[PDB]
Design a protein around this nucleic acid. Structure first.
Length: 204
DNA sequence: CTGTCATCACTGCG
DNA sequence: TCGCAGTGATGACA
């Protein structure tokens, strides 16, 4: 296997194609059958005083007895299902990193997206990495430095762009989520779904 | 309880 | 098609 080291000021991530095509295809099929996504209130978000649907489907799974915060609410993730344990075990076996929680984001096509944000959701263990595993359609991913955002940014730190491919792993290491925001921009020419899994080590 | 800070995705452009 | 500029109610935190 080959790893691409992604490096910039305050940015430390690693990228590899972790699952081969055949295995990644099988995993994607099973995820599409089995993952149960949020409906109702959890699929709505208020932004600048206006209510919208979250522009992607979401779900959480994790170890028994864990709780987390999802927009002002204390929730329990769903118990692990085998396909998720399979993915987690391969990531852990390869990297030596351990996780007890996963957030799943499903992008139905290129019109589903996520805006600039940090995973400084800190139900997280201090300094622990997040493993971002992708299945389905390739989608463009963008890292932007915290001081390079908006109309008149204080600094002009170069944007880091890469596509996240089917079966890929992007390890995001501290302090990436302190100094950088990431996003998945709208790509209208993408017609196929993508499932992204971000494995995390959350506090007990 | 109070005040500062970060936050999320859309519309309406260009 | 892409992406910038402008839009605030709400929770975390000390």
């Amino acid at each position: 296997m080959s790893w691409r080291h992604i490096r910039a000021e305050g940015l430390d991530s690693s990228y590899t194609v972790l699952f081969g095509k055949a295995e990644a295809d099988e995993i994607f099929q099973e995820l599409e059958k089995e993952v149960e996504y949020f409906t109702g209130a959890l699929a709505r978000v208020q932004v600048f005083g206006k209510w919208h649907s979250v522009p992607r489907k979401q779900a959480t799974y994790g170890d028994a007895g864990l709780t987390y915060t999802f927009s002002g609410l204390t929730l329990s993730p769903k118990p692990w299902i085998p396909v998720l344990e399979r993915i987690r075990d391969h990531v852990s076996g390869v990297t030596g990193q351990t996780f007890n929680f996963v957030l799943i984001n499903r992008y139905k096509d290129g019109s589903d997206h996520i805006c600039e944000h940090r995973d400084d959701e800190r139900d997280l263990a201090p300094g622990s990495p997040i493993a971002s595993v992708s299945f389905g359609a390739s989608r463009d991913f963008v890292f932007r430095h915290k001081d390079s955002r908006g109309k008149s940014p204080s600094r002009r730190v170069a944007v880091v762009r890469l596509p996240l491919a089917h079966g890929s792993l992007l390890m995001m290491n501290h302090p990436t989520n302190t100094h950088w925001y990431h996003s998945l921009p709208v790509r209208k020419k993408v017609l196929a779904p993508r499932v992204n899994l971000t494995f995390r080590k959350i506090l007990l």
